[PDB]
Structure formats: C-alpha cells, structure tokens
Curated annotation (Swiss-Prot), chains A, B:
Changing T274A: Reduced channel activation, probably caused by decreased interaction with AKT1. One of its GO terms (molecular function) is potassium channel activity. This is Endosomal/lysosomal proton channel TMEM175. Composed of two modules of six transmembranes, forming a homodimer with a tetrameric architecture. The six transmembrane regions of each module are tightly packed within each subunit without undergoing domain swapping. Forms a central ion-conduction pore lined by the side chains of the pore-lining helices. Conserved isoleucine residues (Ile-17 in the first module and Ile-207 in the second module) in the center of the pore serve as the gate in the closed conformation. It comes from Homo sapiens. Changing L211A: Does not affect selectivity. Changing Q296L: Increased potassium and proton channel activity. GO terms for cellular component: endosome; endosome membrane; lysosomal membrane; lysosome. Residues 28-42, 94-103, 171-175, 219-245, 297-311, 377-378 are lumenal. Changing R6A: Impaired potassium channel activity. The record marks L214 as: Hydrophobic filter residue 3-2. Changing N281L: Reduced potassium channel activity without affecting proton channel activity. Changing V21A: Does not affect selectivity.
Length: 412, 412
C-alpha cells in the first residue's frame, strides 16, 4: 500500500505524449489540391486520435478515482494499460488508411479490448484487496454493486468493439456504427479530478509549445559542407535561411505559453472541475495543438498576397477557437460558481474582471485580427504581427489595463 | 500571490523535453567507419546537451526554492526563461559542429547570458516584493545579503560566458576553458526539491519510453500503393516487415517502464534528496535515454553473429549503467538513511531487502547477460531475449522471490 500521485502523474505524461503524437505528421507536411487534401486528412486524423486518446485518459482517470491507493502489482498493471493505450493512434491511423480492409478495424477493436481487459484486471485486483479502494467505496453499503457497475462500465467498450470485429468480416458500416457508439454512449447515455486535468493540460501545452524547437534541432542545424559551399563559409548566411523557422518557433511558443498562462490562472481558482469543463478543456487542447501548423504557414513563403490573407485568417481562426473554448470553460464554471470557483472569482468578486480579461484577451484579439483581414487587408499581416507584439504586453500589463477600464467605468 | 506548483510542473515538462530533444538524432541514425564515427559524435552531443540542460534545470529548481510563491509577472518571466533555455541544445550543437567558428561560441554564450539575465530579473522582482519569497528568506534579517548572494550565483555563468565570447575572437581554447568552468565550478567549488526531481525523471522516462512508438506512427504506417504493389495487397505482409520495429518498441517500453517502476519505488521512500542523489539521478537518466538505440540495434539485421554479440553486449552495458546508477543512488541514500529514507527502508527494516532486490534486479540481470555473451556466446541473443522475458516476471513476483531468499537464509 502506497500513495498513487506519482504513478498517475507518469500516466498523464504518457497519455499527453500519446494524444499529441499525431500532430507531428501534420507539422511535417510540406506546405496543389493533393497537398490540401493530404493536409485535411492529416488534420482529421490528428483530431480523431486526440479525441480517442482523451476519451481513454478520461476513462483511466475516472477508473483511478475508484482505486484510491496503488501497489506494486497495480503499478505494473497500470504500465501495461499505458502500453496498450499507446497503440491507439497508430492503429487508428492504419484503420482509417484502409477503411475497407477488415484487418485495421480488427486491430483497433483488439487494442480497445486489450485496454479494457487490463482495466478490468486492475478493478478486480483493487476490489479483491479492499484497502486499495477509496474510503467512500471501502465503506459503501454495497461495495460489490460498485464492482458490478465498474466492470460493466469498463467492459462495455470491449464488448462493442468485439461485436464490431465480428461485423468487419460481414458488414463494415455496422462495425463503424458500434465503434462510434463506444465513444458516444458514455456522454449521450460527474466531477473529474482536477490534478489529472491539470497534468494532462500541462503535458499537452509543453509538447505543443516545443514542437518547432524539436524540429529545428533535428533538421535545421547547418551542415559544414553546405555552409562552406552554398553560403561560401558564412555561418550567418546559413542561419539566415533558417530564420523563418526561428520566427515560427518564437510565435508558437509565445502563443502557447500565454494560452497556458491563461489556463493556469483559470485553474488556480477552480475548486472542482465538472466533466463539462473537461469536455471544453479537451476541445481547447485539441485546437491548441494546431497552433504550430498555423505559425509554420504564416512564416512560410507568400506566393501571392491572397495566400498571406488566407494563412493569417486560418491562424486567427485556430487561435480564436483555442482561446474561446477556455472562455467557454470559464463561463460554464461561472454558471455553477458556488461549487466550482473560489469566492474571489465569483460574480462581482475581487478577481472576477481580471480573470475575465485574462481569458478574453486572446479571443477578442483574434477576432479583431480576422476582422482587419477583411476590412484593412492591405495591412493584414502587419496587424497580425502587431498582435503577436501586443498580446504578450497586454498580458504583462493586464492589471493596469483592467484598472484603466475600471476607472473609465467609474467616470462614466 | 498564488501557488507555484503547476508552474514548476510545466517548467519540468518543458525542461525534460529540452533535455531529451537530442536523442532523436541518435535514434534516427541507421546502421562503415563513417557511420560509427557519426553515431559516436551524436551520442557525445546528446550526452553533453543532456548534462547542460540538467544543469540549467538544477539552477532553475534551486532558484525557485528561494522564490516561494508565484505571480502573473513571475509566470511570464518563467515562460521567458523556459524559452531561453529551449535554445541550449540547438545552439550547443551548432557550436560543436563549427568549433573554430566564433559565431557558435558567441551564440552559446549569448543563450546562457540570456537565461542568466532572465533569472536575475526573476530574483530582483521576487526580492522587490518580499511576500513572494519563502518564509525562511522572508523572516531573515539578511535579505540584502541574500539578494547579493543569489545575484552572484545566477550571474556567475553569464559573466564567464561573456568573457568567453570576448576570447572567441582572440583565443578560442580559453573560451572553452571558461565555458567548461561554468558547469564545473558550482560542483567543484544542499538538498534538491524532491517534487522537481520526480517530475523531471517522470518526463524523461515518459519521453524515452515512447520514442519508438512516435517514430513508428510517423514512418511505419503502411502506404496503400506499396501494400497493393510490393506486398501484392496483403496488409499482413506489409506489417511483417514492420515487425522488428514493434519488437524494439516493446522491449524499450518494457525496460524503461520497469526502470521507472524501480525509480518510483525508490523515491516513494525518500524523505529529502541530497544533491549527490541528484547527480546520480542525472547520470541514470542520461544512460536511460540510450535504451531505444540499444533496442533498435538489437532488433536490427544481423550481418554476422559477431555483430549480434557486440550489439547484445552494448545493450547490456547501457542497461547495466542505467540501473547501477539507481543502485548507487539507493546506496548513497542508505549512507544517510537517518534523514534521507523512511524508517521502513532503513538497514534491517521491513522493506529494506525488498527495495534492495527491486533496485538490483536489473544490474545483476545485465551483468549475467554480459557474462553469458562471453561464456555462453552461442546462446547469447537467446538468453538476452530470455532476460527480456525473465525481468518483468521477476518484477511481478519480486515479493515471492524475496520471501524465498529469506526462507533460504532462515534454513541456512
Ligand atoms: C513582452 C514582449 C516579449 C514577451 C515574450 C514572452 C512573453 C511571456 C510569454 C513568453 C513569451 C513574448 C514574445 C512574442 C514574440 O512575438 C514575436 C513573433 C516574431 C515576430 N517578429 N516580428 N513580428 N513578429 C516574440 F517574438 C517574442 F520574441 C517574445 C518573448 O520573449
Ligand atoms: C509478463 C511478461 C510480459 C510483460 C510485459 C509488460 C508487463 C508489465 C510491465 C511492462 C512490460 C513486458 C514485455 C516484454 C517483452 O519483451 C520480450 C520480447 C519477446 C520476444 N523477443 N524476441 N522474440 N520474442 C515483450 F516482448 C513483451 F511482449 C512484453 C509485455 O507485455
Ligand atoms: C476474445 C478476445 C479477443 C476479446 C474478448 C472480449 C469478450 C470475450 C468480452 C469483452 C467484454 C465482455 C462482455 C462485457 C459485458 C457483458 C455484460 C454481462 O452482463 C454479460 C457478459 C458480457 C457480455 C461480457 C462477455 C464477454 C465480453 C464480450
Ligand atoms: C552581450 C551582452 C548582451 C551580454 C551582457 C552580459 C554582461 C554585460 C553582464 C552579464 C553578467 C554581468 C556580471 C555579473 C555580475 C557582476 C558581479 C558584480 O560584483 C560586478 C559586475 C558583474 C561582473 C557583472 C558585469 C556585467 C555582466 C558581465
Ligand atoms: C463479465 C466478464 C467479461 C470479461 C472478462 C474477461 C475475459 C477475459 C480476460 F482476459 C479478462 C477479462 C476481465 O478480467 C477480469 C474481469 C473481472 C474480474 C472479476 C469478476 C468477478 O469477481 O467475478 C476479474 C478479471 C471477465 C468477466
Ligand atoms: C551587476 C549587474 C549585473 C547584471 C545586470 C543586468 C543587466 C541587464 C539586464 F537586462 C538585467 C540585469 C540583471 O537584472 C537585475 C539586476 C539587479 C537587480 C537588483 C539591483 C542590484 O542590487 O544590483 C535586479 C535586476 C545589472 C547589474
Ligand atoms: K529526421
Ligand atoms: K516528446
Ligand atoms: K518527435
């Protein structure tokens, strides 16, 4: 019997890595209609894999809410569960690459079944040793009903996927129907641990922020032969062609760091996060993962000014979605502010307006940038760059801006 | 004023990613003397970059031990510090690629100076607002002397690097001397936060464990055209050629997960980790990062049985080092067991022998495998595979094995 915080932290790290694995094929896509189709397919695959892995992570988190403590065998079983979960993105990609081949569907169903079987073994071991359960379960009137219930919840997905694996040899669309039902039913027919959500979001933000520096380190280190031959021995000339990559990395890191700053400030005032906030956070992270692609597109070559307008608009849309989902989380938590928010950030509270401005800095900025792309298109990219300069400073002097707005309201 | 656990957790995630960025060029090296030289250079670069980034992380951790709580401006300054640290591996690689070009040394010195300047700004802001400091520092009557000491500690590195940047235009070896002095002096002339060490190790283990699955997802998804052309439409035939990659991933994940299990069990019984344990943990993680390369080599083609012997021996050496440094950490903590270990794992304690066996499972296994590579070489790879099967099971039934050993001692 031992504490289980570090094991779940490791689980969150692994699950964030597995959720964000599928953004690498997107950011590595080369910048004609075939390229656009490939990019759309890769974006769709990334979104679906992120949603699936986040569903698996949510199931894991609400599984280990029941299993209070951990043990050596529980740690090994959790490691096995993590290994089985790590195959979700690759196997789903193989599935969607060959939709009419039953082998891909069979492999996806087998992966989901393996995850469910390991989780069922974990639950069975936990209930066989009651000291590992949470005190509420350890004391529950009918503890074994909770088992009959947790086994059903855990094994519902494996059963539907097993039936889908059956139907893949006879009727593939039916396999698709039950496979989508696996993810649909738990939400279409409860609080989520705030520590797990915080750790998953921190992992996702850390991974997304440092994608471009990883890529630059892997590829964009100048080669001495090319330095002495293409750039005539001038290392600064060699690094000049790499400059757009550095600018894209700086922009992506600044944006993702500021979004994480807003998220961190939001969650420092959350007492307990409902699953609606969990869904909104999942959507926010899914759209945050697309920021490096937007920055790569904007920093890329501009064949025509219309291409620059389109890329600036796309980047603004991605930023707007990624931040508006955080704003939606904040409003949803405000709806139940009695039990979800600290007294400081309640309606009319001390920090209410400050937090509102902190979470609305980015959506409004993206909205005005997108509006300028249609009204002041001649300066579009310029104002976009101005935004990249304005937003961090607005974060630096947010309290001063809020005080100025309060004074303006006071004199009005 | 707000709590600073999540900000430091994000910092640990970013720093682990930055520390482990440089193993990707190693695991992408495909395996005549030119290839060996390239692999040796890449391994040396990875080790040096990992050591440098771990030094930066240690400086950050012992910086934010002084700065107790955090604020909005402190969070933004920490983000800037993280961004400046993210350029250490790339700039060091550019430095070592062009040793005689002063530009690389100048860029490395500039990066270190920027990190130091941001940290000095953080310290100055913290001391200007005393409520952000730790209570020890807050109640101290020598706050000015404390500020002077932390400014000196933070800015020592920037000054030496600035002088090295001066000497790069006049005497490059002198720049090398002061640049190595930057890392040498703080250790050649104190406890380290256990949470920070745990988070950094968890990040490193999660990154190293899932390298091969990331690579497989990026590259090893079969292409429909090649599936229908090179494998005559047989998807199982296409996946068969990918099988060695899956085996290497399974082996690497199993080993890294078991090493993390031993590390987690070790640190669940640590009251406070001294910096000697920090150095040993740094070495252990540095050698853990080489496991995917060893597994890739072993799973690769065997041109000659001698090549298989050499690759098995290299993998065994890497595993032995990665686990023997954990064992050395455990023994060092046992030296000061009064203040570093819980009473259960003291000499003659309840869990002492169990933890000893848990941390010595892997070093002894690697040692016997390496010995068999010289005594029973005919079966070498076989016993190596047997080890990959034996060690996890030994972890599953470790308590039973320890009880059997205790009974054997009892009857003796
Ligand atoms: C207060 C201003 C500087 C703060 C900032 C920190 C603020 C806290 C979070 C981490 C990032 C942010 C920021 C933004 C940048 O955007 C510029 C895009 C390139 C470009 N070149 N021309 N137009 N755009 C940025 F470039 C930065 F370098 C930095 C930093 O170091
Ligand atoms: C209990 C035995 C299996 C445990 C293990 C899990 C147990 C929970 C913690 C993480 C590891 C580990 C493991 C190791 C493997 O490597 C052996 C290569 C075989 C081979 N080599 N060459 N031909 N065949 C392994 F292969 C596994 F499949 C599994 C698993 O599923
Ligand atoms: C054979 C391998 C590949 C997969 C095995 C999956 C099958 C055997 C497992 C996975 C989930 C399981 C099901 C989970 C849910 C229920 C509801 C319960 O009231 C009756 C048993 C039943 C119907 C289980 C039967 C067996 C089951 C379908
Ligand atoms: C090229 C530019 C950007 C780099 C600037 C770094 C230089 C100017 C800074 C960085 C660290 C600084 C030094 C670190 C601290 C001390 C100790 C103090 O008792 C005297 C000043 C002195 C010696 C500082 C002088 C200026 C210094 C060397
Ligand atoms: C209803 C059902 C469905 C599927 C499986 C199954 C089948 C194969 C497999 F590999 C693993 C499992 C799941 O692993 C366990 C599940 C439950 C239990 C405890 C139950 C009790 O106490 O009666 C222990 C282990 C079992 C029961
Ligand atoms: C001696 C020295 C060394 C380096 C710099 C320097 C220079 C540029 C820069 F951007 C930041 C810094 C460092 O930033 C601070 C330094 C000190 C203080 C506290 C005041 C005190 O007691 O000296 C607060 C912040 C300045 C003085
Ligand atoms: K590459
Ligand atoms: K990574
Ligand atoms: K990668």
């Amino acid at each position: 019997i031992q504490c289980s915080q570090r094991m779940l932290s490791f689980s969150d790290a692994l699950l964030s890595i597995i959720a964000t694995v599928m953004i690498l094929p997107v950011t590595h896509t080369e910048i004609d209609r075939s390229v656009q189709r490939l990019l759309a397919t890769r974006i769709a695959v990334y979104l679906m894999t992120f949603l699936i892995v986040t569903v698996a992570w949510a199931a894991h988190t609400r599984l280990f809410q029941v299993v209070g403590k951990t043990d050596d065998t529980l740690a090994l079983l959790n490691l096995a569960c993590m290994m089985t979960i790590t195959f979700l993105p690759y196997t789903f990609s193989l599935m969607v690459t060959f939709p009419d081949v039953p082998l891909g569907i069979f492999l996806f169903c087998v992966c989901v079944i393996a995850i469910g079987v390991v989780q069922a073994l974990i639950v069975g071991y936990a209930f066989h040793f009651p000291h590992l359960l949470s005190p509420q379960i350890q004391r529950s009137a009918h503890r074994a009903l909770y088992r009959r219930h947790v086994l059903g919840i855990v094994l519902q997905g494996p059963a539907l996927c097993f039936a889908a694996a059956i139907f893949s040899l006879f009727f593939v669309p039916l396999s698709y129907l039950l496979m989508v039902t696996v993810i649909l039913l738990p939400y279409v027919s409860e609080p989520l641990s705030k520590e797990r959500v915080e750790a998953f979001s921190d992992g996702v933000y850390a991974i997304v922020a440092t994608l471009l520096i990883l890529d630059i380190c892997e590829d964009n280190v100048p080669d001495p032969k090319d330095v002495k031959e293409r750039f005539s021995g001038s290392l600064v000339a060699a690094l000049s062609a790499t400059g757009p990559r550095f600018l894209a990395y700086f922009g992506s890191f600044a944006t993702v760091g500021l979004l994480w700053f807003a998220h961190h400030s939001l969650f420092l005032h959350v007492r307990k996060a409902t699953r609606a906030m969990g869904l909104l956070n999942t959507l926010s992270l899914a759209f945050v993962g697309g920021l490096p692609l937007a920055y790569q597109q904007t920093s890329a070559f501009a064949r025509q000014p219309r291409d620059e307008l389109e890329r600036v608009r796309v980047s603004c849309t991605i930023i707007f979605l990624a931040s508006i989902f955080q704003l939606a989380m904040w409003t949803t938590a405000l709806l139940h502010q009695a039990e979800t928010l600290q007294p400081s950030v309640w309606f009319g509270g001390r920090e209410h307006v400050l937090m509102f401005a902190k979470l609305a800095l980015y959506p409004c900025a993206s909205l005005l940038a997108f509006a300028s792309t249609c009204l002041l298109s001649r300066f579009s990219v310029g104002i976009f760059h101005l935004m990249q300069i304005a937003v961090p400073c607005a974060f630096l002097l947010l309290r001063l801006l809020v005080g100025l707005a309060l004074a303006t309201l006071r004199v009005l």
